[PDB]
Amino acid sequence: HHHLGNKLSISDLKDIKNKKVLVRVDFNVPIENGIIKDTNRITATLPTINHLKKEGASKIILISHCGRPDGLRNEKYTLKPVAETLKGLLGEEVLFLNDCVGKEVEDKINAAKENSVILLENLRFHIEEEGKGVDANGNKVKANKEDVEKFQNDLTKLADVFINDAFGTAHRAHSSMVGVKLNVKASGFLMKKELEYFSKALENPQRPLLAILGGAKVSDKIQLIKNLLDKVDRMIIGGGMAYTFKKVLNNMKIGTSLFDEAGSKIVGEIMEKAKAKNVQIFLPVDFKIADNFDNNANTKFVTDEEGIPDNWMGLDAGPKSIENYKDVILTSKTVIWNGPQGVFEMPNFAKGSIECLNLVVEVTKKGAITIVGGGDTASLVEQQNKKNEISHVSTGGGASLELLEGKELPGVLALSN
Ligand SMILES: Nc1ncnc2c1ncn2[C@@H]1O[C@H](COP(=O)(O)O)[C@@H](O)[C@H]1O
Numbered sequence: 001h002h003h004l005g006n007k008l009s010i011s012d013l014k015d016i017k018n019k020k021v022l023v024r025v026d027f028n029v030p031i032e033n034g035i036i037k038d039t040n041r042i043t044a045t046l047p048t049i050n051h052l053k054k055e056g057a058s059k060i061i062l063i064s065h066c067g068r069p070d071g072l073r074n075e076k077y078t079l080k081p082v083a084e085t086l087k088g089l090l091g092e093e094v095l096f097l098n099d100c101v102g103k104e105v106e107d108k109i110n111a112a113k114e115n116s117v118i119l120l121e122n123l124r125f126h127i128e129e130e131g132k133g134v135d136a137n138g139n140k141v142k143a144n145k146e147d148v149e150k151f152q153n154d155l156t157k158l159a160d161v162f163i164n165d166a167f168g169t170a171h172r173a174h175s176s177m178v179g180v181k182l183n184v185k186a187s188g189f190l191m192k193k194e195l196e197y198f199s200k201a202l203e204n205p206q207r208p209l210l211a212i213l214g215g216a217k218v219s220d221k222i223q224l225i226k227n228l229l230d231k232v233d234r235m236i237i238g239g240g241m242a243y244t245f246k247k248v249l250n251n252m253k254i255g256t257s258l259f260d261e262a263g264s265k266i267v268g269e270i271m272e273k274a275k276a277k278n279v280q281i282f283l284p285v286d287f288k289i290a291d292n293f294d295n296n297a298n299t300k301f302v303t304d305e306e307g308i309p310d311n312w313m314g315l316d317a318g319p320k321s322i323e324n325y326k327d328v329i330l331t332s333k334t335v336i337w338n339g340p341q342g343v344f345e346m347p348n349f350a351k352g353s354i355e356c357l358n359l360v361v362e363v364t365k366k367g368a369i370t371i372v373g374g375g376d377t378a379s380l381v382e383q384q385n386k387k388n389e390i391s392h393v394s395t396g397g398g399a400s401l402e403l404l405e406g407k408e409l410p411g412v413l414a415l416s417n
Pocket residue numbers: 214215216217218238239240241258314315316340341342343344376
């Protein structure tokens with residue numbers, strides 16, 4: 001237990017001067033015609049690259065991936081265009097090699113300005129990175145154990161120190177996540193930040209801990225929900241999910257609202273464990289309902305008691321429930337939010353999800369530690385442009401999830417302390 005955090009990071013890594021550092025970063029960026037159209041992921045690693053740079057480092061070899069070429073070189077997923085971006089961000093020349101491992105790679109690296117930055121090609125072009133892959137005719141194909149081993153040592157031969165700045169992909173145990181067997185393994189500033197806020201919230205958080213979950217499906221969250229019930233104090237279940245709970249628990253006339261057949265079967269277990277673990281469940285007691293799934297459709301409000309008429313569905317929290325939010329949230333000390341409270345992507349049904357954000361942002365300033373990790377949830381924080389108003393918005397893909405699901409994250413375990 002308590003594996004998260006308490007690891008090793010760039011910060012406080014003595015003897016970096018004149019050393020060759022290998023950095024695993026997240027460069028999976030959206031691109032159109034060799035034109036990167038969102039350089040945040042690139043700018044984000046600058047702090048790490050900069051620090052290493054002004055510390056000595058004979059070389060700065062960067063390795064990463066983009067897309068899912070599946071083990072075969074696919075020109076639609078080459079990191080070349082990213083190397084160009086870095087030239088302008090660093091203000092100096094950057095070396096691009098169309099390879100990750102090999103003799104030439106090692107040679108070309110050593111033959112490059114003394115404080116140069118070098119960026120190899122997509123690691124995912126080697127089936128040995130993920131382990132499996134597919135072929136030309138699109139058929140599943142598995143790597144060769146000897147090959148994977150060869151690939152992992154070839155990477156380990158690239159440098160002396162290894163810094164991993166790629167959270168969000170640490171839940172998978174790929175060659176670049178657990179293969180670089182070097183002695184010094186530390187987190188990048190990005191990584192370090194993530195590992196910091198999560199443990200600060202899953203290991204020993206300032207109570208009460210609030211978990212805000214949301215989303216249509218309840219069936220694909222059983223694991224998440226349970227693993228949390230035994231560590232949180234309050235929990236708000238919203239968005240679609242609520243309907244399934246409200247029918248199983250209160251015999252509410254859900255109308256046409258979304259109903260999760262599979263999940264309807266785990267509602268008993270949850271409510272039970274929740275009571276056993278002494279966790280308070282908070283569910284909407286009124287909802288805005290539409291006579292058709294689409295923004296701008298006749299809409300009215302009803303209570304859970306009144307119930308939703310036939311051929312009518314609910315699409316957002318009613319005002320009584322959105323007022324009921326203030327107390328639960330503003331009184332929390334730490335908050336893990338994952339899930340919009342309604343169909344936010346449609347203006348008319350985003351009030352419940354927008355008002356929650358303000359309350360989350362506001363409790364942050366009141367001093368509470370707030371973490372978001374949804375992505376679909378973040379996309380809301382992003383559209384609102386409030387990333388900074390929140391303690392930490394995890395840029396973690398599936399990774400964030402599994403850690404909130406209780407899973408282990410190889411990528412992290414393979415780090416020093
Ligand atoms: N009441 C609702 N009805 C339909 N979709 C919803 C509702 N509340 C939220 N959603 C969105 O529908 C999607 C359901 O996916 P998931 O959360 O993965 O089950 C998420 O991207 C939610 O933002």
